[PDB]
Design a protein around this nucleic acid. Sequence first.
RNA 1: UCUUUGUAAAGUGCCUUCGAAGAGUCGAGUUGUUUGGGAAUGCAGCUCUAAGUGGGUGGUAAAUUCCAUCUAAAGCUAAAU
RNA 2: UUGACCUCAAAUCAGGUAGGAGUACCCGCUGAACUUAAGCAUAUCAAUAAGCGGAGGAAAAGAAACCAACCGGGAUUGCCUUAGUAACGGCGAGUGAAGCGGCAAAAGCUCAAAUUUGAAAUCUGGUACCUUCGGUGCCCGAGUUGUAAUUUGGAGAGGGCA
Lengths: 51, 148, 203, 193, 99
Amino acid sequence: NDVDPIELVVFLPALCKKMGVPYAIVKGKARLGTLVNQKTSAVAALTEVRA
Amino acid sequence: PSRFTKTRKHRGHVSAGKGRIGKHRKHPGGRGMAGGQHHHRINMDKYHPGYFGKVGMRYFHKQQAHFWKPVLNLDKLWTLIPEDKRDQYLKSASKETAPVIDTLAAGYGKILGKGRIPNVPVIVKARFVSKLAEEKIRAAGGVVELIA
Amino acid sequence: GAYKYLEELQRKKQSDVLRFLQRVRVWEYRQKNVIHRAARPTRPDKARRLGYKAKQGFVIYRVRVRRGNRKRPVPKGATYGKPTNQGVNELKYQRSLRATAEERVGRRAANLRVLNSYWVNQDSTYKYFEVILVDPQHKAIRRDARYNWICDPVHKHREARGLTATGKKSRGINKGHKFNNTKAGRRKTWKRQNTLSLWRYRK
Amino acid sequence: AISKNLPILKNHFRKHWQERVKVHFDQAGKKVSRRNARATRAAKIAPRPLDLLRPVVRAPTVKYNRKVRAGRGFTLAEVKAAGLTAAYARTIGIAVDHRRQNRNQEIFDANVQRLKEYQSKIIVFPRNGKAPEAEQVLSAAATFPIAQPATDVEARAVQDNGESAFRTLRLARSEKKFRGIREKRAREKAEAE
Amino acid sequence: TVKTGIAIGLNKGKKVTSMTPAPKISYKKGAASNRTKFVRSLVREIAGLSPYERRLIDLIRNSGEKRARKVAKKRLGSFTRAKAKVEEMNNIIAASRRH
RNA sequence: UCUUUGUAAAGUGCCUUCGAAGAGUCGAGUUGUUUGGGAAUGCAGCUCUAAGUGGGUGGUAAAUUCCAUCUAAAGCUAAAU
RNA sequence: UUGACCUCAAAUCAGGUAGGAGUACCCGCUGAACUUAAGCAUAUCAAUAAGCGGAGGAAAAGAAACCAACCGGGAUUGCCUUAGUAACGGCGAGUGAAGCGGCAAAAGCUCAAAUUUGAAAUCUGGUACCUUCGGUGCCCGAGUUGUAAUUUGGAGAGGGCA
């Protein structure tokens, strides 16, 4: 939610809606960064899941 | 060179061939074409008539290529063929081998008709021709067709 | 790629969202200094196409330059001369505000070359530019010879000489018949066509 | 400041031309330096011919389209038609132009023939091994001189038709001058039955 | 078209047999890619309409196309700029009116 | 010389899906300067501010309709000087 | 409470870098006036001198958003021509290019817009070793708001097929 500058992800909800992929505006880019072993991520996605 | 200029003959003559009364000054009449309408009117209107004014239309971005059209007269036309073979062409005047002359490759745009081409048939290649030039070419028995 | 969406979405400069962003951004650009380092570009897509790679060595300054014309500095507004030059107001500077921004940034951080600069925002009395700067003395940029041309000594202070995108525009260095006076430098062309070229064997 | 029957001499020296005068005393000196530069370049890149191979192309404008001249480079279409790749042609000493386009067959035929007779007249050393001892020629343009196309036979029979060539010229000119009005009038008749 | 083979006229020029060369990938810089049309469709949906654009929509849909076309020429650069914008807004009106 | 150097790269012919190509930017108006550039050459300020078979240019402003040629708003590069 | 991240600081922090000189030439900005017009205001001198800023052995420009209208040429630069011409100008004084052509020299390219997604494959810095204008190993960092490879429109990419 806290992407600075905000226009980087401003179109993602629109892009996600048109393609129909579920999207979640989660609080904190540091949380995304720490689940990708980085400082920040500003975005994260799953494309495949174990059975 | 200096030793022949008349200033050398003018050493010793006080006014240096420029008059005592006149006292040759630095710019008495102005500078350049100055006063072409006020005090040099007579000189301009006697020796350069038509100097002042706007006659004609303003042509924007005039390229001399568009108007490239060198003139060629019928009398000068025979000069294009090389000398060694000119003599055999004036003689044996025959329709079935008529010399062809690439006036355009020779650098001439139009064929003009100063006249008196002899009664031999000559194929003329040019960008443009005139009424009398083509008539005389036909009169000589030749033909003129256009190129580009 | 996100930058394709970012470029087109940043083109709509009068949309409600872009207006709100520039309303918020112009304020906090104003409450900061005239020249201040941006921690990251606020137009990453524009920086990317102007050559900004997010590797250490590249520097982004934000610079705030006054709008309006240039008032001729003559005391009491009296220019002593023919009336064709008495005009002290309404005189327009010949270098774009982009070019003025690049110069003041360059002279502030003299250890960096001005790669480029781009409009980022604008208000009544200021224009805002983010100036792409590249450090020529950083080993990262000295290496990677895709960028080692800028640490060549001929490229130092290219904004002062007028070599960036704005400098090329201001000097009118473009191909065409529109630029016949300014094709390689108007002073070179002027000197070219005002020389008297005399030869050993006169023509 | 003006008198007598003298032509109006438009001399552009109101400016301070004196600081900007350039007199070429070095014309002899620059010629010797240039010849030395040609000597050292040839000695540097021996035995390649010190210059590229230029195509023969027709000059533009109506004034000069009667003369062919050495253009910049062979268009990519000409290079492939010779059976090469653009990059390979550049290395072996063939000037290549990417922005020129081939729209004339006669020019195209000359250039691909120019390339074919260039390949058969050069030899290329292999990258690895003992390069054969070759003697350096200094002018590729001279070895393949630019040739004026042969127009037609010196003298042929008269193909008369009584066309009155001048009348054709007026007819063609009048049609060009009146093409619009003759079309527009035809348009008005067509729209108004 | 083939030339007429004479120094003046409509198709003045020497007779030559031509090539019709392989078209350059250039001359297609304005061609809209499939992804590019997708991107610009997305932007219009999410950014919305610019201020004057909404005024033009009001003007074209209430007063008349010609009176909106003149103000677009003033608002935008030139006539063809106004022509392309107005034809676009009739399409957007039709698209936004339908369904 | 090679255990350095081929879980190597490069070029090439088809057919197919494509083919992304730069925004306060072009451009327009006005102002000032400048140009040989003249209904405005270029630049600059302010206002307005785009499109994608689009855009620019085609030295008379405008509209209608075609054609021709390039691909801007990012960048580098020796020599002749 | 404790770790982050984001931004902003400080340090006689580690390592660097800028200034100033010269300035003949070069790149911009600013910019006059004397003078000429037999006066003078537009014009001219002049898009000059002075002032300011910035480099190099040259610099700049440079590979077309070109010139053309041709049977088309094909980065830039310079010379001869164009041409004292088209054009500008109290259309007065004066000002005034460019295309084509010949020649000198010729050299072409690189990014951004593509996902590597079967593995950030990238890079600085510290440290140890060495054969040190650097290389290797490990580590800390930067970097996913995008670093390498691949493509730059002349094309090119992907998918087979040999």
